[PDB]
Each structure stands twice: as structure tokens, then as C-alpha cells.
Amino acid sequence: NDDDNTEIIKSFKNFILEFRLDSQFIYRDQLRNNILVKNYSLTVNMEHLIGYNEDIYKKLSDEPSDIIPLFETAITQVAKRISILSRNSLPTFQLILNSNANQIPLRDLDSEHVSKIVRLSGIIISTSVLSSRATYLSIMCRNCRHTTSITINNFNSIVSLPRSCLSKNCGPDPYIIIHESSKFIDQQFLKLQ
Amino acid sequence: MGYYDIDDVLADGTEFPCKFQYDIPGLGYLENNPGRPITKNTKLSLPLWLARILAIVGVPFVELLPPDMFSTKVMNAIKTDPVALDLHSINSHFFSLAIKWIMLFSEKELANVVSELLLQRAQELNHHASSLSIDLNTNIATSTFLLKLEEMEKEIYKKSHESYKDTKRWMFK
Amino acid sequence: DAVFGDRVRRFQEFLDTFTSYRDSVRSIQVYNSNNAANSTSLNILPHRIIISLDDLREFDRSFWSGILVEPAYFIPPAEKALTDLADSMDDVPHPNASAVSSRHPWKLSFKGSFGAHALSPRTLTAQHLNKLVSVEGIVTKTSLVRPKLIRSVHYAAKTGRFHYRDYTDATTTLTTRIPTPAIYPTEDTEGNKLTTEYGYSTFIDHQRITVQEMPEMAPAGQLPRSIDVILDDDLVDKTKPGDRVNVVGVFKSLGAGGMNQSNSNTLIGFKTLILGN
Amino acid sequence: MYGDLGNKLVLEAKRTKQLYARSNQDVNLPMYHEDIIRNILKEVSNLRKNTEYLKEQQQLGMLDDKVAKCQYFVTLLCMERNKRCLLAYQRLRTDILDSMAWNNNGLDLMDTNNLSHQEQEYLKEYCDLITDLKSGDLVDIDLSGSLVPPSDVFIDVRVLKDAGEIQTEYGVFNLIKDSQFFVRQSDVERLIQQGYLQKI
Amino acid sequence: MSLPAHLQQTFSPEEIQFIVENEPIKIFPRITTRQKIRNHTRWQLITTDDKALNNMVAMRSTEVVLWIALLLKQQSKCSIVAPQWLTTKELDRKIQYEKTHPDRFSELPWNWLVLARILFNKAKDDFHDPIHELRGKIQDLREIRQIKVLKGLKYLNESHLQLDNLSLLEINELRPFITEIMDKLREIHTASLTA
Amino acid sequence: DINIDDILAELDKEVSPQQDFSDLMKSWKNERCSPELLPYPHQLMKRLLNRISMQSQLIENISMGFLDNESKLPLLCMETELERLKFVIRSYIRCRLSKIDKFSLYLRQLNEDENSLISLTDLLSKDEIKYHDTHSLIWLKLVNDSILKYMPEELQAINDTEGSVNMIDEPDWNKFVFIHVNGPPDGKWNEDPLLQENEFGKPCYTVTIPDLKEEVELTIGSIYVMRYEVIRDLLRDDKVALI
Ligand SMILES: [Zn+2]
């Protein structure tokens, strides 16, 4: 799966680097301007992604929860390329999509559209307080003190601490989270009516 | 420090805390007692264009006290996080007044702090000025940082941003 | 632990440079000694020193930034340095048979300017975690002061020797360590029965106040947000509900937040709270 | 003190400053603040009379050097400050007037009630001075012309306002409304600046 | 006043393009003004050399001032030859130089940005390399050079500054910031040194 | 082996409109950036104006002759070239006029100073003299009859330099400008003095900043951001050029 993931990452990287409408590389300029003001994101329009290479859009719209983290990785790599002098510690960039697809009524979201990308309208009636979802999860083995790391994508498929000492038995669940070395992001729950 | 510079004119007209040194007669026209004179060792707030002259001519008539905007609290705030300091609320003309104070008192330590403050804030305002919005069809951080600039930095930012915008508009025409 | 020792010696140098903190430690120690030597008296000064962050920045900017950015690695060494300073300059009086066993580490408190860390419970996002932040607001709830165990001293009536055991929790120590099930060791290594020695053990008070942003500071259309501070020891009962407050502490997180098999797609977060200093 | 009116005056002048900066709306100078000018000028007269009153009272009376010097010195400083505020306001208005004259010598000669009599006379003579410059020796070059470099020799233009027929150097232009030309940029610059042709 | 506010102490990019357009460039003429041995009006210009214009021979490379090469390229009467530095091989070499030396700029010509823009707009069909790649390498060079500038504007002292090899458009766009921050850091220093 | 370039140069040793235009552009570039009012090049501008007049007459005559092959490219090039030259002179003159407006009183006090080493006749053109005089007079009349009429004689001077704040505006001598070190105007290096060769073999100038008591080496073919006061002497000798 490494080869396909790398191919997808490289394809969307080339989309970031090469796309331009008329004399201006829209997404290179947007990425640089976003980095300058410490806005680690990239608002990617969907018509542009369709026009560039419709195969990429097909791959994205097929399994969004598996492709979008790859696109965020590609955005991060492009950001390092165009904002860091070769020879880090740059957060994984966030992909913000803009679409003009037909709006699906909120009551029409049924068994189909599950795991699909849907565009819909409503009125917010509640906003939760900010939570904290971990992205970098520094972790240490309880018995043998085998410190490692876990990286979280936050796009739930449909991950947990390893159930192994992963390098005497150390038990079934030998891992405790090191909270002074982890990195978190804020998450908010809405409620659409 | 031009004569007709409105920024300098407005900077001159800022009240400053200054105590008196003489039991001067007949003054105080608008100082709460027109006819009645001003007592010695009286603390009064005077415009800079007046206190500057009154603190050199004469023992000088008026002794200038350290203003709050250059107090050790503000100095510590400057030395801690220069970028995230709301210098517009401290004084809308902070840099001009700091330059005037250094010129008056030859303060080699206030200057060494305000220059570093200016450099550190110039980095960030260049970052904000050179980042131009692109329409696919203003940022929150840019707008929340532009509220914390004095009348001097608000002009450097305007000039540099206009230059960057003109270059972008020409290149991509 | 070369870095730990380096931080300890650097903070000892800082304390030697600014003698005001040494004078304050001396004043606290002589006040405690005089109160012990002199009755309906209960005013005993706490083992806490308020150091100015400005002095630390002017002395060693690297240490100051380490305190303000990653206090979990810079505050324990500074506290150990303060404890060693107090012990070295202590008047070495006669022991009371309890202070020898009962730990009394010298805690640290901070003041001065914070800059980007002078926050409010609404603007306390997840990018401030593990950093030393100060939040201002109104105390709305205060838990009951409930003592918690941090060290149990045991006497084995077969060898005439005393065995202790340290306890750590997520809400007590900044650095993460293996939690202890808080069960007293009833048997020694060599099959000896032990009796717990209360009064030689060490318990510390524990309170959990709730600080919410001032209602007039709330943005148009939203109710005030709140954060939970965990005051301990000298800082218990320092606040009552309705008090406007400015709490300085380390914005910490705890838990596994899912990532425990029990939750695979469950999208809850971690429990975040401030360890008040 | 005594410069509060002057401080308000220069604050309003700052507003006019940024006001006209704003891109290029070629805004008209906000009507002269005559009322504030009158008050500060009256404030100056009171200060001058106070000096005259003190000087005559110093002569007949027994006044030591201290108060006689100090009161006069403070009044002089206040008068200088008021003069500086008035001068800054007038100089900004004069600079904006000069910019308008230079830019509109090829555009229009105009509400003029926003200007005092002195300012109206100044602008009226300044236009004549500019025309004198454009005719003395630098007559070959159009000193009032555009300051944008002449990139392209040939441009296409669209007629905004109908103007019937206008004679060019050799032929003639029939300025029919909503009709597009393709002519040299040299012979239509004045019309484009005035507001009869639009494109580029 | 006579000179507008935005033209006070800097050059508008149009004026930079005007300055660049006076530099000679090499063209392949599509006409022939060379009078045979066996009438016609000659150029006889006053701000350049007309010798190379009255002696044009079709498909024989000459050198004319850029604003005339563009004027002929408006029709199909010439073909601007791209300068040697404007090829994919040389652009890759310069990019490698920039990535290899993070302290100094590459030796690009002072008009590289302006010339690249002008040639891409008016002479888009005279490049031996695909223009969609030349644009992508020009943008990469601009990005690297912008990264190095932002990390050197961190050295804005009050004495001087050496911006070696910087282009003309980059200097022009950085002028109102550098030359107005250094002025303030100099005024502070001179105020301190009033003794 | 021995070098034979000397004999090769020996066997090869048996005011132009292009140079006039190049000097005009150099003067325009220097004028746009220099804080002070640079001296007027009277001779160059006289030649340039004569050239414009003669070329306009030539274009008119050729057009009349054409008004009776069909090669119109030379005429179009003549017209657009003349337009470009006129624009350059227009911008130069208007920048000088703006600087005159900014520093009117400073120029006046230079004129009235008998100890001054410069004169407006040697630093301003005739039209600039007339414009400066008329503009100063009319602005003086306006300010008088609007503000200074109601002010006493001790506070009626328009050039009071003895007040609380100096009211004559001087050019910012220590302003920071972008300089490109041309080197000596001629192609020969050893002939020109002040060119202390630096290490690494690159020749360089040497200028000292009195405020900081610092010596900086101005390498040839390099771009600097230097104080204008330090550069003024080299700039007057065309050894450097303002970018
Ligand atoms: Zn293990």
C-alpha cells in the first residue's frame, strides 16, 4: 500500500505545484500567503481539482476518508519545499474544500452517502466547547520503557494504542501516553438543523 | 521631525507627567486656575511641545517625570513578546514619542529596547504586508494584528503592502 | 539525567545572582522557626517563593523560554534547586521526628509579564497545552478540600526499620509517570508484616476550582466558557465562588481519549485542566 | 490648555489626509473648517492682548524679571503651537490643491465652494503658473501629461459619453457613443483623462 | 504636488518595465531593410542606434532595443530570441545554486523577472523549451529568492546592508520597507547618541 | 608563457545621442531616489531639448512628404521613441519640481546665504527658478493673509529657525538609499584613486560612517543599502548609481 499512497501523494503534490489558470500559480501563492500569516491550511476548490486531472477527483470522491490525509501530507510536503531552505517541525496542514455540487437536503442523507462527500445547508443550533484530539502521541512502554511515537490522521475510517510491548512480555496493554511530549489539536462539535 | 508633519504635530500634543520647580506667578491660564498662580513642587500634566521647552530653560522651571508608557512594566512587556503587544492602546504615537524621549534624555537603554522592539515587529508586519489574498472564484490573523500598530507602523505597513500589491498586479496582469 | 542536573545548577546560579529570593527564603525559615519556638498560634508560612519571570528572562533567556514553553521539563529542576537552596541555608535545628519523613519540597510561583500566555478561558485553545499560561476569570465552583496521599511511611515491627513509598498521580506531578494503585504495602520484601505510620506519612490537600471567563468579555451571542484549575497544598481555599481571579499554571491534558479499543470511531477528546501554581 | 482647538484642527487635517489618500477618488477637500480657524485665531488675539496687557502692566507696575519673563515666554510658546497647527492644516490643504491642479490640468477646471477666497485665488493663479511652465521652454514635452510610461503605442478605446465630432491632428474622430476605436495612444490621452474614452 | 504620493521615492513597476525595455535584445527579423546595390525611410532614431535596424536581413540575428523588438513582434515581423539564461538547463542550474548556497543569491541578471514576464506575454511562441516549464522554474526561483530575502530582512541594522545579486524588481518592491525601517532604527540610534 | 596582449592593444590603438539618453536615464534614476535636490545638467538637457525639437520637425516634414514604398514602421518607431523620451524628461522635471516644493525655504536660505558654496543658478534651471520664485511668493501671500496677518511680528516670519522647532525643512542627508557600485566611469581601474583593492582580488571603495565610526568596503559590482550622506561624494562622481 506504500506505493499507491506515495503515488497519490505525488499526484496531489504536482496538482499543488503545477496548477495555474492564467500566469499565476493559484495554490502555490495561496500556500505561501497562508504560511506567512501562520495559517497552516489550504482552501482547495473542487472545480480546479476536477479540471486539472479528473482521475484525482474520482479517487478523492470514492474514498475521501482515506485519500484526504494523503492530500494533507502532500500539502505539508509542498509547504516545506516552498517555505523552508533545504539544509522542520511544521504542523500537518489542513485541507479545506470548496464545492458547488448540488446540495443534498439534510433529511435526504440516508444509508447511501455514507462515507461520501455531501454538500448540505442548515442552521447551526449548538456549538460545543473545544475538545483536544491528539495528533502526535508520544508513548512509552510501562515495563521496559520502550518510548515510541504514534501519528494520528483524525479521519476515522468507519486507531488505538498498540496491544503489544512492540519492543519481558510487558503485558497486553503496556503503553501509557506521555502527555508532556504529545501534540494536540482542537476539535468542536456542531449541531445542524 | 518635519515642521508640517501632522504625525509629529499630534505627537507633540500629548500630556506628560511633570512636577514644577518654582512657585511661578500668574500662570495656569487653563490649568484649573487662570488668575491664580501655580505653586512650587506641583505635579501637572503638560503637552510635550510645552514640557520639552519648560524642562530646559531656566534650575529648570519644570521637572519631567518618567511617563507610564515608558515604565518598567511596559519595558518588561516589550522585552517579553514584542510581536503580541497592543502598542496602539499604550500610545497611538509610541515610536515618535519614544524617539523624542531618547533625544531629550540621551537614554542609551530605552533606545536599545525600542530599536529591538521595532525590528521584531517589523518582521511580522512585513510578513502580513507581503501576504496577498487570492480569490479562487482578509485573514483573521492579519486583521487582529493590524489593530496593534501605532500611527507610524500603520504607515510603513500601508506603503509596503501597496508596493507588494502593485508588483503582484503588474506581474499577473 | 545530565540535562536535569544542568537545569538544577543553572537555577541555583540564578538564585545566587538575585539574592532577593534567598532573603525571602531566609525570612520564611526564620518566621517558621520563631512560630515553632513561640499558644493559640497557627500562622505558619508556606514553602512557596514567587519569582519574577522578568528577572529570569534577563538572567538566562533560554531558561525563561523553557519555563514559559515547556515547564514540564524546567519547573521540576527549578523546584529541586530551590529545595536544595533552602536545605543548605537551613538553620539545621533539631528534628521533630516528622519533618524528616514528611516531604516539604519548596514549590515555585511566578509573576511578571507573560505576553502571548496572558489568556482567558475562552482563548485557551489546544495549542497552549503543556505550556505555562495565566487565565483570568470568575471562580464559579470550588470542590471540597480532600487530602490526597503522596507518600506512605511504614514501620516493620520485626527489624526496627522504616520503609516508605512515594505515590504519583496525573494531577500532582508535571512529568508523566506510571500511576500507583494507591494501595499500602502490607508485606515487606522479606515476608515481614508492616503497619502504616500515619503522622509520618505525607498527605497534601487537593481542590479543583472552576474558572470561567468574565461575562462581559464573552463575544456577542455566546455564553462564557470555563476551565478547571487544580489547586493543591498552600493554594487550597485561596478562592471562593464569585471571586475574580488570575490563575497561573501549566495547561495540562490527561487520559487516552479513546485510543483504548473501547473507542474506535468515538470522537471524544482528552480531559484538559490547569495545574495552578 | 490653549492648543486644544489646534489639536482638533490637526486631527481633522489627518482625516482629510487619509481621506484623500484612499486610492484615487480625487475627493474634494472637505469644506474649509472656517469655524475652528476663527476660534483659534480669536484665541491667538486673546493671547496677544494678554501679552500687551502684561507688558504695559510690567512697565508701570513693579514686576520682577521672573514673572514678566515666564508669563510672556509661556504665551509665546502657546502662540507658536497654534501657529504650527494652523500652518500644518493650511499646508496639507495646499498640497492637496497642488495635486488636484497638476492632475486636472488635463481633466477639468473645477464644487469650488469648499475653498476659501485665499485658496481659490491660490488655485486660480497656480493653474496660470503651471501653464507658464508648460510654455516657457519645456513646450516640446507636455509637462502636464501622464506620468505612466508609454508602454504601447496603439490602443483600442470605447466612447463613454457622446461628443459628436472632434478634430484630431490629421483626420477626425467621430465620438459616437458605444463605438470602439483602434488608434494611437498619443492622440487620445487627453480625452481618456477627461472621461470620454474608457478602454486602457 | 507635481509627483504623486505613490511615486515619491520608489519606481512603479510600470517604470521598471520601461527601464528594462531599453536594454538590447537579439532578434530574428522577418523583414529585410538592407538596401540592395541596384524610396525608403530609415529609422534615424535619437535615443538608440539605428544602424542595426536599417541593415536587417531576414532570419539573420541582430540586436535591437527591447521596446523595438516588442513593437516588431506586435506584427509577425520579427522573432525575439530568448536569452541564454532563460532556458530550462540554466534555470535548473540557478535553482541548484540557490539550494546549495543558503546565504547568498544566485547570479541572475538584474532584469530577470521583468524580462521573463515580458517575453512570456509578448513572445510566447519563440522559446525552444515548453513555456509551461519555464514558468514553473521562474516561479521556483522567485520562491527561493523570497525565502532568502525574508531571512535577511532579519538583519536590518542601522549602518548598512549588502543585498548582493538581488534583482531590480525585488529591490523595487522591498525598497519602501527596508529603507523606512532602517531610517527609524537610525533615528533611534542618533537620538541615543546625542551626547 | 609571456603575455602578448600589450602589442595586440598597440596595433588596435590607431558626445553621442545614445550617451545623452543614457546620461538622462542615469540622472532620472538618481533624482527619483536621492533625498537632496541634485544639480541640474544644463548642457545635457539643452542638447536633449534640441534633439526633440529637431526630431519633431523631421517627423512633421516626413509626414508632409507622405501626405502627397508604404513603409510606416520607421515613422511609428520615431513617434513612439519620441514619446518615450518626452516621458522621461517629463518625469524628471516633475520630480525636480516636487523636490523644489518640499525644500522651498531651504533653497531660499541657500540663495540668501553669501557663505553658501552653491547657487540656484548653478543648481536649478531657469524655469525651475521662475517656478520656485512664483510659488514661494504666492504661498507666502496666502499664508500671510490667512494666518500670519493675525500674528505678531516676532511670530510672523515664514522661515523662523530660532523657534521651538525648526521651521525650515532640510533634506534627510542620512536617508537610506539603494546603491549599485558602478566603479570608475571609465573602463580603467588603476587610473582612478580611492579604489583600495580589497582581499580576494575584488577592487572596492572605502567610506566611513561618522556616527558609528565604522569603515565599510564598497565592493565594485555589488548592491548596498547605505546612508545617502556617506555616498554623496561617490554619487557626485558617478562611481555609484542609485538603484
Ligand atoms: Zn515493553
Curated annotation (Swiss-Prot), chain A:
Domain of life: Eukaryota
Miscellaneous comment in the UniProt entry for this protein: Present with 10300 molecules/cell in log phase SD medium. Early fractionation of eukaryotic MCM proteins yielded a variety of dimeric, trimeric and tetrameric complexes with unclear biological significance. The MCM2-7 hexamer is the proposed physiological active complex.
Family according to the record: Belongs to the MCM family.
Role according to the record: Acts as a component of the MCM2-7 complex (MCM complex) which is the putative replicative helicase essential for 'once per cell cycle' DNA replication initiation and elongation in eukaryotic cells. The active ATPase sites in the MCM2-7 ring are formed through the interaction surfaces of two neighboring subunits such that a critical structure of a conserved arginine finger motif is provided in trans relative to the ATP-binding site of the Walker A box of the adjacent subunit.
Full protein name: Minichromosome maintenance protein 5
UniProt-annotated location(s): Nucleus
Organism, as annotated: Saccharomyces cerevisiae (strain ATCC 204508 / S288c) (Baker's yeast)
UniProt subunit comment: Component of the MCM2-7 complex. The complex forms a toroidal hexameric ring with the proposed subunit order MCM2-MCM6-MCM4-MCM7-MCM3-MCM5; loaded onto DNA, forms a head-head double hexamer. Interacts with CSM1.
From Swiss-Prot, chain B:
Compartments it resides in: Nucleus
UniProt keyword annotation of Protease present: no
One GO CC term, this protein: nuclear replication fork
Nucleus listed as a keyword: yes
Gene3D superfamilies on file: 1.20.58.2050
Extra information: Present with 2205 molecules/cell in log phase SD medium.
Function in brief: Functions as part of the GINS complex which plays an essential role in the initiation of DNA replication by binding to DNA replication origins and facilitating the assembly of the DNA replication machinery.
Similarity comment: Belongs to the GINS3/PSF3 family.
Protein's recorded name: DNA replication complex GINS protein PSF3
UniProtKB/Swiss-Prot annotation, chain D:
Pfam families: PSF1_C, Sld5
InterPro entries reported for this sequence: GINS_A (IPR021151), GINS_bundle-like_dom_sf (IPR036224), GINS_Psf1 (IPR005339), PSF1_C (IPR056783)
Chief localization: nucleus
Record keyword Cell membrane present: no
Subcellular localization: Nucleus
One biological process term in Gene Ontology: double-strand break repair via break-induced replication
Key words, A-Z: Cell cycle, DNA replication, Nucleus
Record note on what altering residue 84 to G does: In PSF1-1; temperature-sensitive mutant. Defective in DNA replication. Impaired chromatin binding of CDC45
SUPFAM superfamilies: GINS helical bundle-like (SSF158573)
Family: Belongs to the GINS1/PSF1 family.
Role according to the record: Required for DNA replication. Functions as part of the GINS complex which plays an essential role in the initiation of DNA replication by binding to DNA replication origins and facilitating the assembly of the DNA replication machinery. Required for the chromatin binding of CDC45.
PANTHER family hit by this protein: DNA REPLICATION COMPLEX GINS PROTEIN PSF1, PARTNER OF SLD5
Further comment found in the protein's record: Present with 1431 molecules/cell in log phase SD medium.
Protein's name according to its UniProt entry: DNA replication complex GINS protein PSF1
Naturally occurring in which organism (per UniProt): Saccharomyces cerevisiae (strain ATCC 204508 / S288c)
Gene: PSF1
Curated annotation (Swiss-Prot), chain E:
SUPFAM superfamilies xref list: GINS helical bundle-like, PriA/YqbF domain
Listed transmembrane segments: none
Listed Pfam families: PSF2_N, Sld5
Subcellular location: Nucleus
GO CC term (a single one): nuclear replication fork
Protein known as: DNA replication complex GINS protein PSF2
Function statement: Functions as part of the GINS complex which plays an essential role in the initiation of DNA replication by binding to DNA replication origins and facilitating the assembly of the DNA replication machinery.
Main location: nucleus
Keyword line: DNA replication, Nucleus
Quaternary structure note: Component of the GINS complex which is a heterotetramer of SLD5, PSF1, PSF2 and PSF3. Interacts with PSF1 and SLD5.
InterPro entries recorded: GINS_A, GINS_bundle-like_dom_sf, GINS_Psf2, PSF2_N
Biological process per Gene Ontology, one example term: double-strand break repair via break-induced replication
Cleavable signal peptide: none
Similarity comment: family membership: Belongs to the GINS2/PSF2 family.
